[PDB]
């Protein structure tokens, strides 16, 4: 039943089609008469289900394209390891993690740009990196440049293998549709094989390499004097000195005397007082426990031996009296539509990136990460953005599913059909919740700005006036503080010092400490609730009305991506599902901008800073969040104005690139408004006059110049808006935190 | 209501009539072109002004033209 | 098939009638550019390099005027006579000759070969025999002079030493 | 017992590769167990093998010749020929810089045109028609095939031999001839 | 011949020509830095 | 002229030279002579001297920065006039050979195909023929080949 079936030598390896731009499309293969064709070529290149009607041929392109993506990721990773090996102060940084700034990019001396080679320490000049690679490599037990070089070479070999495999599984051995539709098998393998064995094999690295290398580093042994990882594997006495359980070997594992591994596998919680990172014995044990969970989980689904669940039977069984046919059809939906799967998978991967952002700052997993404030701020912010983009993508592919792949026959009185049948109730209620949240969240800031401006501080929503205590969040912090020895009896310390208990310092710098929630924190949380509900409104409205509305009863026929259905019916600009995604991007940008600003200011005000010999905490912005973050004026003045000081004063320093990129990003953002605020009708008419001048001088091109399509105008607009807006914050953040952190 | 006009360069291709989602238009006999038929706009009280007809018209310039006029429940496409 | 490189196929646009043909074009520049232009360019670059190789050789004790007393150092010499305003007179005179010899059609787009094979600029005052293997003798001397000149100037840049002194008994 | 159809002569248990028919000079065995020729161009692989053969053979003889005696003006401090120490010296001398130039010149102006000709199918891989002394005979004869088979067998041996040379010198820190004489 | 047609496509020739152009300008500024006048 | 003086004789200009060396030396003080950090910073110090010496001949404002004169005065020809002529020669070349190639493509069977897939031999032919573009352009102008006739160019209704 679960079988490998491929077609052999299915596509000849020829440059013929490389010399035929737009070969993949019947509409484009004929070549350009206008410049619109050039844009269309790029816009359509990866829209595989538009090229062919064959689900098999789409599936095979996807599988092969995926290998292309992994090949590129391997080149990028390889690059990061090679730059570490060749152009970094990593080895020097290992000997002084608190004093030396990580640097793995050196610029060439040309037109004076060598100013960007900063005095980072460790006997090089270069750009200070915020990716946290050094903290990752230190956690992995890498102590020398040979180990980084060999990883970089290994990366290039994996990139090569991914390219071969992509080529091979498209041109030589292309799996049939029935191969791809093995969702039960795929999930067993991905759960037990990818995640389970990934976590098991990584736990292996941690126990055998990371643990011994980091224990000796944390004791203060010179990284050159540390035995190479293989010596811990070869000489068991070496390992037994560090972790005595290694005397008893594997006998305690097979005999279920697992308490013998209490040294290597712990439940300490909290952080190393040395590194300000999670105890690697906690992480090794986490990865062992997760590995088992995943290997067990990947035995759920029926393959070739009778045992296991039919996902079809599971879905169809989950039927109640309020939800019609329940999950009937969804197995067919998810085995016949790539877009349906991409919708779910982007929602979860995006949501995961956001969970990772929160978990990694609060439970700093890498040694010397917590007190590398540039890295902490960068990693949180980065993973927030990746998460946001993925969630908006989920909206796009959910809507593409609704237009292209949805059938009423498959979705007959199932949860999907029933949702469409009360889309008016869903969207009216969510609309209401957005107005309720917006008025009662943003309104509190405006109330406060007004009362403060009128000299009425006693009339404000604040810790010192009308208090809005986040009592439920405060109560949960208390429970998590009281957990160790109580509801987590074997846990020695809290999961996170963010919840309560001690201030962890590395040198003088604060790694983590209790993040106290007051009126300012209550207010910004309701802004986040607000910005997320609106983004959901836009994207969900896009999905539920993708196929039709009362305005456009045949919207599915017009497609996913179309500018409008003309100025009639009062005007139908931006009715398409694509246009909902377009609007969703701005709100995602709005939502996440406020999240990373909340993060930056709260951490600087209330968490990050120095602890003196006396033991008094001095925060970077000295606790100004509680009284400043309850007005918009406080955000403008005490956050943007005050913290922009570093980026705008960066000229003539090693941070001058951030100053330039700050202005460059503002430029690109502003430039975006030209596309967003205008319409192609103006531009096509302007081009007519310019074309006249070229005709006059007999220099008009045969490929007729066209204004961008209405949709491309919007695509260009939002792309420059996001690039400009995000890159501005990037330059602001990095200049700020590299200076003050 | 919107005004829909058909000019004499109509080649009777029927594409405007096929495109109209409100059944505003129909093909009528006519000796003026080889097709032996011309677009007609007898039901412009139902015209929403979407200009799908103009989009469909292959003649240069357009043989069918929609002049957006006074708005009505029907022309605004209102289901309330 | 190529006489010079038998393992490679013959450059199609080249022909044995052309002077100094060995069928030597591994990069296939004769496919990229019109052969008549390349042929004209080859013999010209030759003829210029030929005179350049003699200039450096004859610069020893053969007609030094009352406007002599300048070093043979390539870059310092260039800088001196440009400042003097002698090189600008030579530039316009070479510019004049180029327009006269090619009779206006000087561009790669414009230059034509109506009743003249590439190299035939109609300069034969002594009236020595042309249409024979004499063209191959010009080419071989021109090709050798181009590499020759390259050998002179690079020797002049390396150790700042005289072209003819190098081939006595000296090593770096 | 053996497999059903044509079996690989070199490995009688494995099926014969589709492209390797035993006709090639040094490919009577049809030796391709991992099935590279099944996925990759034979003309490419053959060009690479013969190139490696000729580079390796010069390099193995080079090591032995340089061990026995080096030139005076080349002040060779290291007696280990496949050491970083010696390699680094003759990069800084500009000796390996010079031969890199003419190797790079060959590969770009000869080797790459020659490879492209072979992929088009207008050149036998490794053929530069270089036989001044005529120690091969006429191109395609039984004498030529014996020498072609001889080239690969000598080259394949040198390729492997150079592995032994490098690795043994890296452990012992002794000459290849020095190692043979002293244990 | 098809590979050469590909290498003649707008984006490849633009990339290679602007690479060459950028190289010349970069190399001129390496050897003749800080040229504010002729 | 008090507003502009020769940079050589300008105290603010000398002060800027001293400040830029001091900043580089304050950085250099944290490195140990033979180090790459020292040598890199020393290279920059050497080029600071060479730059300020080079710009000495320019006119300087009270700011101590070189100010360019672009009024046509031949004493400042090197600042604008010569770079201006060079600019127009290069871009006139680019424009001319572009027009030449475009005119070639309109004689071919698929003109649009020759705009996205270049005829490289023909592109090279026109590119290498740009060096006398002002004469070429003059000859096309004189011959009535430069400009299209008003009759033959499409316009919208007035
Ligand atoms: C143990 C079995 C196994 C493993 C490890 C994987 C892993 C993967 N599959 Mg899955 N797959 C499997 C079985 C497995 N598959 C089966 C049985 C089916 C058919 C039912 C599929 C059908 C399938 C499809 C249709 C797709 C995937 C994709 C993927 C990749 C998802 C992206 C990612 O997370 O990159 C993680 C990357 C890495 C961990 C690095 C590369 C790992 C390579 C491929 C080797 C790993 C296994 C190997 C045995 C390791 C040896 C260890 C060594 C020490 C000896 C991932 C590499 C997607 C993809 O991207 O394909 C290219 C994709 O589209 N799989
Ligand atoms: C500051 C800029 C700004 C503001 C204030 C708004 C406001 C709104 N947007 Mg818009 N939006 C914006 C920029 C903005 N947007 C931009 C740039 C875009 C393009 C990407 C959009 C695209 C967009 C989409 C696609 C959607 C929204 C929606 C919303 C509404 C969200 C629900 C809500 O909170 O209503 C309440 C109003 C506010 C929060 C604004 C101020 C409230 C004050 C402080 C309290 C009330 C004051 C009182 C009544 C005043 C009396 C004074 C008077 C007597 C003089 C809200 C009206 C969504 C919506 O309609 O949700 C239902 C929606 O789907 N917007
Ligand atoms: C160094 C490069 C090299 C290359 C490119 C080739 C290429 C070729 N060989 Mg040759 N071969 C080589 C070295 C090489 N060989 C050496 C050193 C020997 C002596 C053992 C041989 C012995 C041999 C025989 C007897 C035959 C061939 C044949 C061939 C042809 C078909 C098989 C093939 O596709 O191999 C592709 C080979 C490679 C891509 C190189 C190997 C790459 C792997 C990944 C290297 C590492 C593997 C592993 C770690 C090695 C150690 C493992 C363990 C044993 C310790 C092809 C032209 C057949 C032929 O038809 O001849 C005309 C044939 O019958 N080879
Ligand atoms: C191809 C070029 C080549 C060159 C330039 C040399 C040069 C030299 N050889 Mg070598 N040799 C070569 C190839 C070459 N050999 C080959 C192919 C072999 C066979 C493996 C040898 C085997 C050999 C031996 C046994 C000796 C030399 C020695 C010498 C040196 C003699 C110095 C002298 O007495 O006057 C000289 C540097 C002698 C030496 O080392 O000088 C003291 C010496 O004893 N050679
Ligand atoms: C693309 C156009 C381009 C051009 C016209 C040049 C031109 C030159 N290069 Mg440069 N070079 C280039 C790109 C270019 N290069 C690129 C992209 C790199 C990075 C790989 C280099 C790296 C480089 C090095 C390392 C060197 C040169 C050198 C030179 C000079 C040799 C004479 C010459 C001026 C050489 C030189 O003379 O400088 C000392 C030299 O050593 N180049
Ligand atoms: C838009 C107008 C503009 C103008 C007029 C200039 C002009 C100049 N720039 Mg600026 N610059 C600009 C935009 C501009 N730039 C932008 C947008 C940036 C950000 C990317 C910069 C960043 C920048 C830096 C970082 C530097 C310059 C430098 C220069 C000088 C370069 C001289 C040179 O390359 O050698 C001479 C080049 C030629 C003569 C070209 C010859 C071309 C061919 C080979 C000739 C063939 C023969 C016929 C020149 C004064 C440099 C300088 O030295 O400042 C004083 C310098 O270091 N520029
Ligand atoms: C051979 C190419 C060529 C030539 C000779 C011209 C000439 C002209 N352009 Mg046009 N233009 C071109 C390409 C060209 N353009 C391209 C590709 C675009 C799209 C970006 C434009 C967009 C454009 C606009 C928007 C305007 C002009 C205007 C003008 C006129 C005023 C001068 C000017 O502004 O130029 C400077 C031109 C630009 C800054 C635009 C970009 C020029 C590109 C980069 C040059 C491309 C060269 C080409 C790739 C060479 C390939 C040749 C090779 C294959 C042999 C002049 C008639 C103006 C006008 O109408 O004046 C009356 C005007 O407003 N052009
Ligand atoms: C999560 C709580 C959901 C409670 C809905 C109630 C719930 O769980 O009931 C779920 C209920 C279960 O029906 P069945 O028993 O038929 O379900 C069988 C299933 O197998 C098929 O889905 O279905 C409904 O009635 C549809 C939901 C309508 C509910 C309308 C309100 C939705 C807005 C909720 C606002 C609160 C959100 C707070 C988030 C923190
Ligand atoms: C040739 C050819 C082209 C053809 C372009 C052809 C038709 C151009 C048409 C021009 C029109 C008709 C009138 C031009 C009017 C010229 C103006 C009126 C310039 C006045 C000078 C100022 C006033 C400088 C003053 C000054 C100077 C003197 C000295 C400075 O220092 C001070 C200032 C103050 C700047 C292309 C486009 C195909 C590209 C190809 O590549 C080459
Ligand atoms: C980096 C280094 C440099 C030099 C590095 C460089 C060139 C060294 C490369 C080493 C290679 C050549 C090893 C080769 C590995 C050989 C394998 C392992 C043999 C196959 C496996 C067997 C076993 C199968 C055979 C057989 C089969 C086929 C048939 C059977 O019948 C019999 C057996 C017998 C088994 C410098 C000097 C430039 C300076 C730099 O600073 C440092
Ligand atoms: C500015 C603007 C334009 C005009 C912008 C256009 C037509 C795009 C400009 C094209 C750029 C400049 C690329 C063209 C460059 C050529 C490919 C030549 C390249 C030459 C070398 C660099 C290789 C629109 O068409 C438009 C349409 C709808 C809504 C808003 C707008 C809008 O805001
Ligand atoms: S303004 Fe643009 S998007 Fe809106 S109806 Fe008109 S054509 Fe369509
Ligand atoms: S689409 Fe235009 S040409 Fe065709 S029938 Fe309608 S009005 Fe006439």
XYZ file of C-alpha atoms and ligand atoms in Angstrom, chain A residues 686-687 689-695 697 699 701 705, chain E residues 13, chain F residues 91-92 94-102 105 114-115 118-120 122-127, ligand 7:
102
model
C 3.470 59.863 -18.669
C 5.313 56.980 -20.466
C 5.097 61.352 -23.743
C 8.518 59.774 -22.910
C 7.937 57.139 -25.690
C 7.137 60.080 -28.076
C 10.639 61.604 -27.379
C 12.321 58.196 -28.062
C 10.285 57.773 -31.326
C 15.094 60.263 -31.970
C 15.381 55.103 -30.141
C 12.266 50.016 -27.954
C 7.101 50.352 -22.211
C 24.510 40.340 -19.854
C 27.301 58.691 -21.871
C 26.971 59.984 -25.470
C 26.463 54.573 -24.331
C 23.355 56.312 -25.791
C 24.680 56.303 -29.403
C 25.667 52.560 -29.491
C 22.343 51.734 -27.740
C 20.439 53.614 -30.520
C 22.685 51.885 -33.173
C 21.887 48.382 -31.759
C 18.151 49.236 -31.347
C 17.105 44.886 -34.037
C 16.871 40.753 -29.868
C 16.054 43.189 -26.947
C 21.200 40.165 -27.238
C 22.919 39.489 -30.587
C 26.322 39.806 -28.780
C 26.200 42.923 -33.257
C 26.152 44.533 -29.741
C 30.025 44.395 -29.717
C 30.145 45.848 -33.295
C 28.086 48.951 -32.279
C 29.737 49.250 -28.799
C 19.916 53.179 -25.921
C 19.158 53.477 -24.907
C 18.585 54.817 -24.667
C 18.758 56.133 -25.310
C 19.648 56.572 -26.437
C 17.799 56.961 -24.536
C 17.603 58.396 -24.776
C 16.810 59.224 -24.093
N 16.033 58.929 -23.042
Mg 15.603 56.993 -22.478
N 15.415 55.239 -21.423
C 16.061 54.104 -21.719
C 17.077 53.968 -22.757
C 17.561 55.049 -23.628
N 17.148 56.305 -23.591
C 15.718 52.938 -20.873
C 16.211 51.516 -20.889
C 14.699 53.467 -19.969
C 13.955 52.734 -18.876
C 14.705 53.023 -17.591
C 14.602 54.875 -20.408
C 13.687 55.713 -19.665
C 13.634 57.118 -19.922
C 12.799 58.054 -19.143
C 11.848 57.915 -17.997
C 13.153 59.306 -19.834
C 14.094 58.982 -20.800
C 14.488 60.146 -21.580
C 15.464 60.026 -22.701
C 15.843 61.229 -23.508
C 16.603 62.267 -22.680
C 17.946 61.843 -22.092
C 17.770 61.025 -20.851
O 16.993 61.294 -19.946
O 18.579 59.847 -20.791
C 18.871 59.268 -19.545
C 18.019 58.050 -19.431
C 17.812 57.430 -18.266
C 18.373 57.847 -16.932
C 16.988 56.191 -18.309
C 17.897 54.970 -18.269
C 18.913 54.856 -19.403
C 19.417 53.411 -19.530
C 20.041 52.929 -18.229
C 20.413 53.229 -20.685
C 20.330 51.802 -21.246
C 21.420 51.514 -22.282
C 21.199 50.203 -23.042
C 20.951 49.030 -22.087
C 22.393 50.001 -23.975
C 22.394 48.667 -24.730
C 23.141 48.751 -26.049
C 23.880 47.490 -26.466
C 22.950 46.287 -26.524
C 24.597 47.750 -27.791
C 16.757 60.628 -24.565
C 15.984 60.648 -25.888
C 13.793 61.315 -20.998
C 13.054 62.067 -22.046
O 12.017 61.640 -22.510
O 13.629 63.308 -22.526
C 13.021 64.105 -23.534
C 12.932 60.766 -19.921
O 12.149 61.433 -19.167
N 14.424 57.666 -20.959
